[PDB]
Amino acid sequence: LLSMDMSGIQDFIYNISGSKALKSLRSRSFYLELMLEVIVDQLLERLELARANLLYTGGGHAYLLVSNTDKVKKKITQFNNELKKWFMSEFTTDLSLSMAFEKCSGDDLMNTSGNYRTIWRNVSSKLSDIKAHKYSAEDILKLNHFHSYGDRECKECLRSDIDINDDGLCSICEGIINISNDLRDKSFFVLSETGKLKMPFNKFISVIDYEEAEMLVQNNNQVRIYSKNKPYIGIGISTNLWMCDYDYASQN
RNA sequence: AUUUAUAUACUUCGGCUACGUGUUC
Numbered sequence: 001l002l003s004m005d006m007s008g009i010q011d012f013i014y015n016i017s018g019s020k021a022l023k024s025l026r027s028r029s030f031y032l033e034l035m036l037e038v039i040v041d042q043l044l045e046r047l048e049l050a051r052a053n054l055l056y057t058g059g060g061h062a063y064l065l066v067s068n069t070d071k072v073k074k075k076i077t078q079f080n081n082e083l084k085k086w087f088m089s090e091f092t093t094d095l096s097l098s099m100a101f102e103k104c105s106g107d108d109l110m111n112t113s114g115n116y117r118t119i120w121r122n123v124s125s126k127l128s129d130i131k132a133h134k135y136s137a138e139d140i141l142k143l144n145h146f147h148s149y150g151d152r153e154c155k156e157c158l159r160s161d162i163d164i165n166d167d168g169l170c171s172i173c174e175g176i177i178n179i180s181n182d183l184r185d186k187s188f189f190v191l192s193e194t195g196k197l198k199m200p201f202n203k204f205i206s207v208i209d210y211e212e213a214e215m216l217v218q219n220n221n222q223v224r225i226y227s228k229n230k231p232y233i234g235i236g237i238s239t240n241l242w243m244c245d246y247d248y249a250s251q252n
Numbered sequence: 253a254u255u256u257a258u259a260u261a262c263u264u265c266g267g268c269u270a271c272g273u274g275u276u277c
């Protein structure tokens with residue numbers, strides 16, 4: 001039973017002070033949500049496994065029931081290592097993820113003597129105490145010695161480490177603005193290798209409509225269409241992602 | 253030269269901080 005926790009959502013989502021703030025917030029919550037979705041899907045691809053194995057997602061949590069094999073464990077550990085590398089490379093304190101798992105048996109799941117709750121609490125506890133130790137030695141040394149030439153804080157996004165560009169905006173928040181602009185009109189989001197917004201596994205997210213999504217399907221491209229609460233799509237890798245995106249300002 | 257001594261009605265009714273504008277280089 002594998003559990004994942006996102007570290008810093010309540011902080012990173014609430015460093016917004018600009019005039020376009022509302023557009024980013026819809027884009028920022030969606031950005032974290034899509035991060036979690038793409039990372040969990042990518043994990044399930046590593047496990048050569050099915051989507052039905054995801055028991056619960058939401059907030060910064062995720063719950064999976066995967067095979068108890070040494071192979072599974074080595075893959076989980078390796079992907080955790082690469083994952084931690086990537087987040088350290090992009091935000092380094094604002095967002096982190098945690099991995100944890102604890103053995104369970106069939107007798108446990110069948111609700112024999114309430115041990116289901118015992119294992120649930122055990123996995124929660126291991127997830128919540130592995131967050132104490134997040135950084136090995138060499139990583140913490142690696143952070144502290146970068147006399148690296150960089151620019152200053154993003155206006156929309158409060159971050160010293162980030163480097164601003166045109167109009168005093170960094171790349172990440174400008175892409176956030178663009179995808180926010182596209183949010184209200186277009187309903188489908190694609191996982192593509194060129195795209196707009198930087199995403200974990202060397203991937204990028206852009207926006208599509210059902211027709212060019214269809215062409216992408218007949219383009220046999222390794223794509224995952226992520227939708228805005230649309231059933232009956234039947235387009236490639238159908239992913240009716242569950243999200244509430246409402247704005248009265250678009251009713252004018 | 254011998255009785256009043258101000259009396260009742262109404263004791264303010266009608267009509268209820270706008271703009272430049274919030275954030276950064």
Ligand SMILES: Nc1ncnc2c1ncn2[C@@H]1O[C@H](COP(=O)(O)OP(=O)(O)OP(=O)(O)O)[C@@H](O)[C@H]1O
Nearest residue numbers: 006007008009010011013028029032033059060061
């Ligand atoms: N994409 C998101 N955008 C905005 N708020 C979110 C998003 N995802 C989750 N949240 C909410 O923000 C809350 C605060 O997140 P927080 O940073 O405290 O991390 P967490 O997931 O609760 O875990 P922990 O605090 O143990 O690290 C979450 O509990 C959740 O309800």
